[PDB]
């Protein structure tokens, strides 16, 4: 079933999340000053 792959996309969520915390936080030329945003949910509001 597609359910089988339906995990992958959560993995992709995690990937994005780390790309935020790992790359964006130190590499955000945007938002370079502002921090907080510790949790995934945050940008779902702030820019998503």
């Amino acid at each position: 079933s597609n359910s089988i792959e339906a995990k992958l996309q959560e993995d992709l969520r995690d990937a994005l999340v780390d790309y935020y915390l790992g790359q964006i936080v130190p590499n955000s030329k945007d938002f370079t000053n502002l921090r907080s945003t510790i949790k995934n949910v945050d940008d779902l509001y702030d820019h998503l």
Partner: protein
Amino acid sequence: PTQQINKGLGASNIELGTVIQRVDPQFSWNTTQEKYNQVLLAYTQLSSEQIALLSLPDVFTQNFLTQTELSAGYLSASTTEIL
């Protein structure tokens, strides 16, 4: 890429190693080591890229040291009492 293939063959209920051995022209048991090693590496179900991390040599040593501490007297643990 890997994950996908892995789970797809999971749904296939058979393995990439299985497929490689079936696709070998010869009878696999008769084939070469360069097949045997390769196929087992397949049967690992593993990223090779992670293996890069797993296999690149050490950043550190067993112990970093300095002339300052050495002159201040290095000390190793008592260690023969281990096996």
